[PDB]
Design a protein around this ligand. Structure first.
Ligand SMILES: [Mg+2]
Lengths: 212, 203, 108, 50, 86, 170, 162, 124, 89, 226, 413
RNA sequence: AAAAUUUUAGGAAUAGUUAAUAAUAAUUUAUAAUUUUGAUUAGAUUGUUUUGUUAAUGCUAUUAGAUGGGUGUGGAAAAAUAAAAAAAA
């Protein structure tokens, strides 16, 4: 049940093309015009071009150009977080990329959240680090993730990470972060530079004095 | 390897219990050793204190025969065969035993049977293996007959000349076509043998 | 080298061939020296890839511990030199008649 | 089997070839290397009967 | 190893394969059908004048009456006979 | 397979016949005993032609020692301490089979050789690639393990039932 | 209709898809027989001609060098120092793919393979005005043994000879 | 019943019991009104069960029905797709590549507007 | 033909075949039993092969020896007759 | 050949086996070399029924109108992780959650430890690509105590179904080199209390009584009845 | 009819682009003559074509190349004062005039030589052209502009071609260089100007071409070309030493496989060059190579380069002798087109072990031959290897001249 | 790879051509090669002591086959369809 003798030998082990019956009759002149008009339909070429005879997919130099020439779906970034998403896709989503992201790079995306739309862009970068890039998080990753969701006032997603953290990738969650979101404690951190309990609505009850 | 074999056999025969370490360090990974090394070393395996050390050393020797492409000889397998009540190490495959039982029972039943001990000419021998028969069956004819125009037949035909009349020949063809070729249609005399096999068949 | 005396495996210095005969005579030649001194007219490229350093695992465990693996590429880019730095002593027993008994880093 | 070393000499004579001295030397050395000495003497008798 | 495989007679390891002893038949009716024990290739050579390697004999699958019963009566001599040359 | 011989010649003619002398040449080696190093002698035997020079004898020692410990540096041939001129023939020194020849090495150098000539090179230009041994050491006839015995599988004229003629004309 | 069959094959041989798509679009509108079904959309509708690009490049400066570059509409150009390094990347990759020969072509395009031409007089036909360059009819038009029986001569001396 | 052209399960009414199924030869299968491939499959299954092989085989009907829908000439379990006359979008009437409306897709969604309103209420 | 039983590993795949060739350990064990029962027959087969080979070689040896003796006598008489005819010519 | 089944025996074509030699039968197809393969149809096809009621998003769709609620994004991440784990555990999914990328630890397939089969792979190096579920893994193969001398490529390293048990003593940092585990015959001395061989050459496992009962009921020897 | 016939039909020849058009049309004419596919074309004297030309069916096989060469001659008589005008700002540069002269010389060396009785013209038109004035005009236009010769490889091939044009057409090579580099000298030869202005070659083949032009540029003056030493061993002229050291450069002869593409004919040129360098400077070599240490950093570099070149030349001779037609004795073209690599690059490899066009690509590369020593090669190499030694050495005990003589006798028998 | 053997009621010229060759992949040399002892082309055209007849070395018949551009895959293109040649339990 092999296609060794039904198609040319350069289509050996070939899967995932649109239709491999196209590339056996390309050299016919009515199909040769159709291939060159399709390369003009795809853009990126200043001269008439046909793909090589022993290639079914586009060449590696040509698909690299069309991926770089393709305009991003997000035009006119307003927030500096949305500029960081465009820097994330130029660096960690380039054509045939090799370098993986860093847990410190995820902390930079989680530190630029201003509006609740930014949390949808930031948490989808957190999903690419766990599922797509498969990166083990740092020890303080849940700390930056918790204070990111409190800037936008979204607590119901922060407690959503506590009921199942090992699918999300938070291998270290300290107990004072667990007691805050579950309702045992009413603060989640102590400031080393200000000596007050965060958030500031609880600091008016707990610490009535300001200490260095 | 034959230089290390005498050293291994000397350390086995002296009972020093260090021939296996010498075989591991010097002969195992860096030599094309035959199986008879272990035929010494199993005796060094035999003199161990506990039976489980003997068993594990024998099984490790079998894994060494598997890994380094040195197959176990018949003498080593018969050495491990004699201590099967103590070690219980299987030294024959699952295929050879099923062949051996069905062969040995059949050969014993065939040797005890008095009917099937008779010789069978279809089974015992080959009567003739040469490409040509040993005596003349009369054929070929080397002549034509009535209605045959093609003589000699050329490719794959033993006819050499026409049956009755021919164009004039010279030399050895003149002696051949008239006297010396085969003729099985002769009612008096068969086609004659070469000398001296014609004098004793004159009558 | 730890079990029999090999003749030219250990020298006192790098072999001084002329610069014109450098590409012709040097490839295929091996020698051991004492200390980490590298030849001149070479660019030092240290092998830090764990995919490339894993093949010295048996060399670093059962024999001398591999400290550094360096690739030396010259100015004309035509003569490599694979420099491996070992740290003594050997885990193998060294014969007194062997070549590595004439080495200070191997005997100490 | 080593008997083929005696066989390919005999088929050399059935096919009307004259076996040279190298064929007899190779047959006797091949049959002596396998421990068949009577077959080597039969090769010698074949050489004498030719 | 063809593009469109011969669907009715597939074989193994290409042509011409190992020599095989077969019992080939004729394109006749069953009442005159006989078999030839032959040695041929795995794929039948249809482009040659040599279509077989060696002819071992002929087997007749129809039983014949024993025409040699009064010669010397032995046990089970009057049964039918299956003639074959080997 | 062009071996410059397209017929059968069972004899050996004059261009392959060489007149050889079995010259044995000594090397000063050192062996390890329980005390220390002891100086001994290692002999390398070659078949040198009678018309050869001493440089050719040195090259024959280099190509036929097949030992990684003997020809390691630049050595010099000598007889009774007196060194030999490598541009002189063996007949000019009267060197025979009983002549004791020594090889004095200079171990500070390093012998860089180029073995571009095969070990079995005669005038007929027939050399093996997997030769691995001088032709004086190898046996004349041995069993061939690389080939395979093949029988006749194509019958010529006889194929079957009755041998009438056998198609011996074919 | 014979002229459009030749001229379409010449433009696809000389790497002209714009001139070939405009020829099939023209023959479908004029009612040429055999081309009323072949009508292609004009993908070069917004693009200028290739000749007017070249004299514009000798003489908006960011759009001057990249006027020949074709974009889908959902594509944007790079910076001009980055795009010009990418434009010479493609022109060295096109010439690398066009220099390697196809091994069983005898140095010919696929239009020229099996393209033997003789006029209509070579196969049992005579002059007609509407057949300007008429390729000779195939040998399957007249079979032997349907015009004359076996061992009988047929009046076609040079038919099957190409 | 594993084959499409061997409908073995269509002849359950052609036998009375187990012994009648296992004692009938091919001539008795022929006179009962069974086609040739079906009675050959029945006799082969009976002779395989007599030799110790129960009918444990995979039903190859749906797999062959999947492989039938392609244009393999020899039914050799390959996949050969059909190529239509128009396989590119430019020749099917579509002029150029569709451009996305970048002002429509870059508007803030309704949940984002509701959360911005909630943030503006809770911050003040 | 390789048998595909119903209790093999099913390939839940709509783009190919519905049953793989991955067995059960019971199927592995019974296949080993059938392998041994074939191994007995093929052992006897190879034994009779080698026996018939050496039988054919021994028969060729004996018949070739007899043919060589008779053919040497025949060729000696033929060469003597040819020498006499050459002398007369 | 190099390794035929039962020597040369050709009474049937099944007597040769399903493959005539462990080497590739043609020189032009090196992928036809005989090796242990893995049922990738059942393993690579993960259960898509855990993604129902879950709105996944494309990578390229970074426009503002296509974004989802952060609770919906988090449940999409949880559903995608449970989709990737749903069949089995990968090598690259087990080693990323380990110290020093799991270097020195022992990875094993499920069927590598049952029956009389004993084989594992001591990991030495893993080079992750951008899609962190794939890549290439290297390790020393240990089969019944004997170990390779060099690290070999772990075949089917991306197909799920792998297992490991983390041991802190086996963890090798990125500064050092992963040492090869010792051969129990050669390197360390043989001890029956430490490691005992489950199988050896010329050894076959005894017949289980349930398989004997099943085969004798299938062949008709035992009276199987409803 | 050539296209140049429509360019000389009465136009204004002083126009610059018309001169450029005439030049490129003549270049294309000479190049299509040189690269003409001459597979089926045969020129045998046929009696039936006496009072006519060749027949209409054999025009392309008999008449085409002769008419092409006669058209080249009749256009060269009309064009050679337009492309290369006489020496009294120019319309054509020196490079394009050099390219036109090179294709004209390539058409002149491969002229039609066989004169049939059918030919009505003179037989002297079937002889090669004399291009001396054109070489002098190109040399004047090349010494007019600076940096005409560069250290690039294409300029190395241009240097080789210009030295070839000066050797063949009796023109001094000193006209190609400015006169201040030749001033202070009464007379210089072609070979001395080659050895004084040679660039350092990056391949062995360019050095072989330079070493061939050195020997052929001075036949009887080969002594005065490469003598840089006195009769006592002291170096006389260091310019020839610096030229000969940068001829046998390390980028050309440095690797052990540097002579892997050297045929049997080029190895004779290498050994003849080494033998001439040893013979002209014997008092230098027999003093310095044995037991002499020198303080000059140039002399040790020259000695190391000469020893390396002699050793790799003898190794290549032993390669071609002891392994005839071996796969390690095969040659190939420099920058040779191996189409299997370009076929693997411009294809999609899903399995990289499956190489497409393997049965054809593994057989075919740009010119690749099995090399063995012929009669004319072995008889010359047996002389040159004996020339490499000294006069006091015994030629009987040399084990390479004896092997070459026995190879000659064995292959002749 | 070689030898060898076809026919035309109104009988004449033929050629990607012959040999040499340091020449794969022919820039050269030659007084080149086939043919009136019947060539090339055109017509007819698988051949085959297997058929039929007769006193007939006469006359008369034939159905084994092969297939330089469909895919450089495969050991070999013979590959777009064949009641078996049973095709790896
Ligand atoms: Mg000539």
């Amino acid at each position: 049940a092999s296609l060794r003798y039904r198609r040319p030998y350069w289509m050996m082990f070939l899967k995932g093309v649109d239709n491999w019956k196209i590339y056996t009759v390309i050299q016919q002149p009515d199909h040769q015009r159709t291939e060159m008009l399709y390369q003009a339909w795809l853009g990126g070429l200043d001269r008439p071009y046909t793909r090589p005879k022993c290639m079914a997919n586009q060449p590696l130099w040509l698909s690299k150009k069309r991926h770089m020439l393709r305009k991003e779906r997000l035009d006119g970034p307003e927030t500096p977080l949305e500029k960081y998403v465009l820097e994330w896709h130029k660096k960690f989503h380039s054509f045939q990329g090799t370098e993986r992201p860093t847990p410190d790079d995820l902390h930079t995306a989680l530190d630029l959240v201003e509006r609740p739309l930014d949390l949808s862009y930031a948490l989808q970068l957190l999903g690419q680090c766990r599922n797509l890039n498969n990166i083990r998080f740092a020890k303080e990753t849940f700390l930056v993730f918790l204070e990111a969701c409190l800037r936008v006032g979204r607590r119901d997603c922060a407690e959503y990470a506590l009921e199942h953290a090992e699918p999300l990738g938070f291998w270290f969650i300290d107990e004072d972060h667990r007691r805050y979101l579950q309702g045992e404690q009413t603060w989640y951190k102590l400031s080393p530079l200000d000596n007050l309990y965060y958030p500031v609505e609880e600091n008016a009850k707990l610490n009535e004095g300001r200490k260095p | 390897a034959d230089m290390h074999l005498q050293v291994v056999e000397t350390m086995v025969g002296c009972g020093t219990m260090k021939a296996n370490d010498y075989f591991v360090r010097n002969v195992l990974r860096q030599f094309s050793w035959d199986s008879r090394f272990l035929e010494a070393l199993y005796v060094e395996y035999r003199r161990q204190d506990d039976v489980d050390m003997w068993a594990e050393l024998t099984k490790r020797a079998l894994v060494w025969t598997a890994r380094y492409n040195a197959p176990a000889s018949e003498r080593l397998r018969r050495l491990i065969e004699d201590d099967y009540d103590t070690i219980r190490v299987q030294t024959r495959t699952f295929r050879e035993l099923a062949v051996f039982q069905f062969r040995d029972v059949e050969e014993r039943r065939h040797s005890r049977d008095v009917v099937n001990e008779l010789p069978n000419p279809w089974y015992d021998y080959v009567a003739h293996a040469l490409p040509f028969p040993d005596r003349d069956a009369g054929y070929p004819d080397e002549y034509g007959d009535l209605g045959q125009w093609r003589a000699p037949g050329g490719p794959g035909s033993p006819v050499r000349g026409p049956g009755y009349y021919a164009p004039p020949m010279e030399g050895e063809h003149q002696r051949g076509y008239t006297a010396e070729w085969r003729d099985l249609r002769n009612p008096m005399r068969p086609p004659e043998f070469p000398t001296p096999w014609e004098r004793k068949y004159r009558q | 080298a730890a079990s029999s005396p090999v003749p030219h495996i250990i020298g006192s210095k790098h072999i001084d061939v002329p610069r014109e005969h450098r590409l012709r005579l040097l490839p295929g030649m091996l020698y051991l020296l004492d200390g980490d001194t590298l030849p001149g007219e070479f660019t030092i490229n240290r092998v830090l890839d764990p995919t490339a350093l894993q093949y010295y695992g048996r060399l670093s465990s059962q024999i001398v511990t591999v400290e550094a693996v360096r690739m030396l590429v010259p100015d004309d880019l035509r003569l490599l030199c694979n420099c491996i730095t070992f740290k003594g002593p050997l885990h193998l027993p060294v014969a007194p008649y062997a070549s590595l008994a004439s080495l200070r880093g191997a005997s100490q | 089997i080593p008997q083929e070393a005696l066989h390919w000499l005999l088929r050399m004579i059935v096919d009307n070839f004259n076996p040279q001295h190298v064929h007899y030397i190779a047959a006797m050395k091949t049959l002596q290397s396998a421990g068949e000495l009577d077959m080597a003497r039969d090769v010698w008798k074949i050489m004498e009967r030719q | 190893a063809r593009a469109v495989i011969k669907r009715r007679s597939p074989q193994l390891w290409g042509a011409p394969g190992a020599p095989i002893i077969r019992m080939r038949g004729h394109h006749v009716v069953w009442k005159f059908q006989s078999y030839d024990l032959v040695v041929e290739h795995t794929h039948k050579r249809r482009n040659s004048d040599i279509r077989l390697l060696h002819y071992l004999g002929k087997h007749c699958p129809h039983p014949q009456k024993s025409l040699w019963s009064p010669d010397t009566p032995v046990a089970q001599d009057r049964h039918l006979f299956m003639l074959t040359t080997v | 397979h062009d071996t410059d011989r397209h017929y059968w010649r069972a004899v050996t003619d004059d261009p392959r016949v060489q007149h050889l002398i079995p010259l044995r040449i000594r090397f000063k080696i050192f062996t390890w005993v329980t005390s220390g190093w002891e100086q001994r002698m290692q002999v390398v035997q070659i078949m040198a032609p009678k018309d050869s020079t001493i440089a050719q004898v040195k090259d024959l020692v280099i190509v036929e020692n097949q030992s990684p410990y003997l020809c390691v540096s630049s050595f010099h041939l000598a007889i009774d301490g007196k060194e030999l001129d490598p541009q002189k023939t063996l007949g000019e020194y009267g060197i025979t089979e009983q002549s004791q020849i020594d090889a004095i090495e200079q171990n500070d150098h390093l012998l860089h050789r180029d073995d571009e000539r095969p070990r079995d090179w005669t005038v007929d230009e027939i050399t093996a690639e997997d030769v691995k041994r001088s032709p004086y050491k190898e046996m004349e006839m041995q069993p061939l393990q690389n080939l395979a015995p093949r029988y006749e599988a194509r019958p010529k004229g006889y194929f079957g039932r009755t041998y009438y003629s056998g198609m011996k004309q074919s | 209709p014979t002229m459009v069959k030749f001229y379409h094959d010449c433009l696809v041989r000389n790497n002209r898809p714009r001139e070939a798509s405009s020829l099939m679009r023209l023959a479908a509108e004029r009612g040429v027989h055999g081309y009323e079904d072949k009508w292609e959309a004009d993908v070069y509708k917004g693009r200028p001609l290739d000749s007017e690009v070249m004299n514009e490049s000798e003489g908006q400066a960011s759009s001057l060098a990249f006027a020949s570059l074709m974009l889908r509409g959902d594509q944007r150009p790079l910076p001009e120092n980055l795009q010009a390094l990418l434009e010479e990347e493609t022109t060295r990759n096109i010439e690398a793919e066009r220099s390697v020969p196809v091994p069983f072509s005898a140095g010919l395009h696929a239009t020229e393979i099996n393209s033997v031409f003789r006029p209509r007089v070579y196969r049992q036909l005579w002059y007609k005005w509407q057949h300007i360059a008429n390729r000779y009819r195939p040998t399957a038009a007249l079979k032997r043994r349907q015009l004359a029986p076996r061992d009988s001569p047929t009046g076609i001396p040079g038919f099957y000879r190409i | 019943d594993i084959h499409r052209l061997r409908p073995t399960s269509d002849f359950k009414a052609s036998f009375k019991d187990w012994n009648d199924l296992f004692t009938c030869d091919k001539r008795q299968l022929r006179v009962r009104g069974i086609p040739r491939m079906t009675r050959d499959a029945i006799r082969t299954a009976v002779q395989a069960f007599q030799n110790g092989n129960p009918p444990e085989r995979f039903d190859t009907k749906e797999e062959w029905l999947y492989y039938k829908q392609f244009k393999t000439v020899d039914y050799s379990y390959r996949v050969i797709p059909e190529l239509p006359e128009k396989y590119r979008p430019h020749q099917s009437g579509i002029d150029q590549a569709p451009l996305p409306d970048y002002r429509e897709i870059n508007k803030m969604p309704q949940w984002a507007e509701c959360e911005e309103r909630r943030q503006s209420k809770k911050t003040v | 033909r390789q048998i595909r039983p119903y209790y093999n590993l099913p390939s839940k795949s709509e783009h190919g075949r519905k049953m793989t060739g991955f067995l059960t350990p019971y199927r592995h064990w019974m296949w080993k039993q059938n392998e041994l029962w074939r191994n007995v027959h093929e052992a006897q087969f190879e034994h009779l092969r080698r026996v018939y080979k050496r039988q054919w070689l021994e028969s060729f040896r004996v018949n070739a020896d007899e043919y060589i003796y008779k053919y040497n006598i025949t060729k000696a008489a033929q060469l003597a007759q040819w020498e006499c005819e050459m002398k007369e010519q | 050949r190099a390794d035929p089944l039962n020597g040369g025996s050709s009474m049937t074509l099944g007597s040769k086996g399903s493959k005539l030699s462990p080497e590739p039968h043609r020189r032009r197809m090196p992928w036809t070399a005989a090796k242990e393969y893995v049922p990738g149809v059942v393993l690579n096809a993960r259960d898509k029924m855990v993604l129902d009621g879950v709105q996944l998003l494309d990578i390229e769709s970074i426009d503002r109108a296509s974004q989802l609620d952060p609770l919906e994004v988090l449940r999409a991440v949880v559903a995608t992780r449970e989709y990737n784990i749903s069949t089995g555990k990968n090598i690259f999914q087990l080693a990323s959650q380990a110290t020093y990328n799991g270097r020195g630890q022992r990875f094993y397939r499920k069927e590598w430890q049952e029956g009389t089969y004993d084989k594992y792979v001591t990991l030495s190096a893993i080079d992750f690509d951008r899609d962190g579920n794939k890549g290439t893994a290297y390790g020393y193969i240990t089969f019944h105590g004997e170990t390779t001398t060099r690290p070999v490529q772990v075949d089917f390293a991306d197909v799920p179904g792998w297992y490991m048990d983390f041991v802190e003593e086996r963890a090798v940092p990125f500064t050092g080199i992963v040492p090869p585990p010792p051969s129990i015959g050669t390197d360390v001395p043989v001890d029956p209390h430490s490691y005992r061989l489950k199988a050896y050459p010329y050894y076959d496992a005894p017949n289980p009584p349930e398989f004997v009962e099943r085969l004798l009921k299938d062949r008709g020897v035992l009276p199987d009845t409803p | 009819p050539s296209p140049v016939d429509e360019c000389l039909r009465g136009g204004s020849s002083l126009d610059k682009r018309l001169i450029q058009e005439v030049r490129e049309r003549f270049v294309s004419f000479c190049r299509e003559y040189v690269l003409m596919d001459t597979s089926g074309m045969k020129s045998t004297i046929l009696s039936t074509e006496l009072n006519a030309g060749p027949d209409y069916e054999h025009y392309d096989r008999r008449l085409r190349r002769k008419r092409h060469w006669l058209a080249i001659r009749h256009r060269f008589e009309d064009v050679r004062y337009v492309i290369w005008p006489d020496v009294v700002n120019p319309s054509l540069t020196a490079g394009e005039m050099l390219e036109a002269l090179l294709w004209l010389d390539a058409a002149s060396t491969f002229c039609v030589r066989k004169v049939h009785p059918s030919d009505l013209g003179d037989k002297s038109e079937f002889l090669p052209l004399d291009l001396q004035r054109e070489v002098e005009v190109v040399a004047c236009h090349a010494r007019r502009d600076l940096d005409f010769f560069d250290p690039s490889a294409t300029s190395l091939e241009q240097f080789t071609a210009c030295a070839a044009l000066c050797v063949n057409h009796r023109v001094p090579f000193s006209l190609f260089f400015p006169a201040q580099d030749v001033c202070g000298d009464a007379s210089v030869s072609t070979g001395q100007c080659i050895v004084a202005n040679a660039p350092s070659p990056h391949t062995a083949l360019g050095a072989v071409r330079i070493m061939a032009l050195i020997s052929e540029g001075s036949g009887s003056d080969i002594g005065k070309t490469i003598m840089f030493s006195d009769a006592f061993g002291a170096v006389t002229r260091f310019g020839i030493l610096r030229g000969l050291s940068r001829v046998m450069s390390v980028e050309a002869f440095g690797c052990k496989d540097a002579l892997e593409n050297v045929n049997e004919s080029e190895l004779c040129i290498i050994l003849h060059f080494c033998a001439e360098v040893r013979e002209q400077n014997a008092a230098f070599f027999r003093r310095y190579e044995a037991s002499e240490e020198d303080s000059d950093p140039q002399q040790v570099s020259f000695l190391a380069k000469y020893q390396q070149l002699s050793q790799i030349a003898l190794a290549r001779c032993k390669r071609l002798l002891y392994h005839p037609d071996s796969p390690r004795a095969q040659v190939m073209s420099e920058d040779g087109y191996i189409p299997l690599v370009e076929l693997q690059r411009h294809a999609e490899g899903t399995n990289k072990a499956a190489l497409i066009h393997y049965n054809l690509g593994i057989r075919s590369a740009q010119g690749m031959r099995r090399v063995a020593l012929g009669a004319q090669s072995s008889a010359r190499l047996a002389e040159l290897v004996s020339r490499l030694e000294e006069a006091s050495a015994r030629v009987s005990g040399n084990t390479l001249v004896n092997d070459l003589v026995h190879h000659l006798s064995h292959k002749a028998a």
